[PDB]
Amino acid sequence: HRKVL
Amino acid sequence: FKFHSGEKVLCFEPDPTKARVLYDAKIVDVIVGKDEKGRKIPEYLIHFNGWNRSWDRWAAEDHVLRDTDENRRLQRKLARKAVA
Amino acid sequence: FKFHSGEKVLCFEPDPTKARVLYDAKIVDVIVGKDEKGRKIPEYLIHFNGWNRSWDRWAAEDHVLRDTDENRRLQRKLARKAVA
DNA sequence: CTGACCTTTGACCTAG
DNA sequence: GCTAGGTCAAAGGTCA
DNA sequence: CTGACCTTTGACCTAG
DNA sequence: GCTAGGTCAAAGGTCA
């Protein structure tokens, strides 16, 4: 649910 | 403790479900906290450079690296993994 | 998980700074939580028999024992240490 | 002898 | 329909 | 002063 | 491209 891979 | 407010650091992705990478960051606040067994452990509020304050996260010492040649190398190495 | 709501159990003192003893208790609520590394771990809300609800504490699985002959023996043993 | 306070239970409703 | 929860009142313990 | 709970404040994500 | 719902972390206030 957060930010960047 | 090991890091101080104002200090520029590298910090691990605080979100477990995401690629393990190292972000440029800054210590905003330190705080003496307490482990499950009541020992004093430091907590560090971290600001992620280039993201706004609403992205600030509390992190354990474990998660915070000194802004060092060797840690920078480790940053680049994790950055390549994550892209690939 | 290992324990269920409604289950009568023994539970460690939740306060590190106090004598390590075992209290008769009851599982009020269980909750799937998350470890520092994002793994699913159960959390247990525990009610301490003979104390009112305002003394209810969240505890890790580690801190909760099955209401068993062997654990009752451990209870007595810790209780004696604590008085002496 | 009384009241405060805790526990365990059976009744019930509601939301899912 | 049944279930898990939540609320509620009855009833018994211990205590000061 | 603490732990639990609840609420508000941004910001994301996944649907549609 | 957008919006609507849920959800998350931080932070703050309340309750006992």
**In contact, C18 and C31? CB cutoff 8 Å:** no
**C62 DSSP 8-state letter:** G
Resolution (Å units): 2.3
- Cα dist. C80→B73, B77, C58, C70, C74 in Å? 56, 56, 26, 16, 10
Measured CA C40 to C1' G5 distance, in angstroms: 25
Beta-carbon contacts of residue C44 (< 8 Å; ≥ 6 apart): C3, C27, C29, C30, C31, C58, C59, C60, C61, C63, C64
**Nearest-Cα residue of chain C relative to residue B38:** C16
User: What is the greatest pairwise CA distance in chain C?
Assistant: 42
Q: For domain B7-66, which architecture applies? A: Roll (2.30)
Alpha carbons B3 and B10: distance in angstroms, whole number: 11
User: Experimental technique used?
Assistant: X-ray
Question: What does the domain layout of chain B look like in residue ranges?
Answer: 7-66
How far apart are the C-alpha atoms of B17 and C67, rounded to whole Å? 37
CA distance B30 to B43: 6
Q: How many CB atoms lie within 10 A of CB C53?
A: 8
Longest alpha-carbon distance in chain B: 42
Contacts of C39 (CB under 8 A, 6+ apart): none
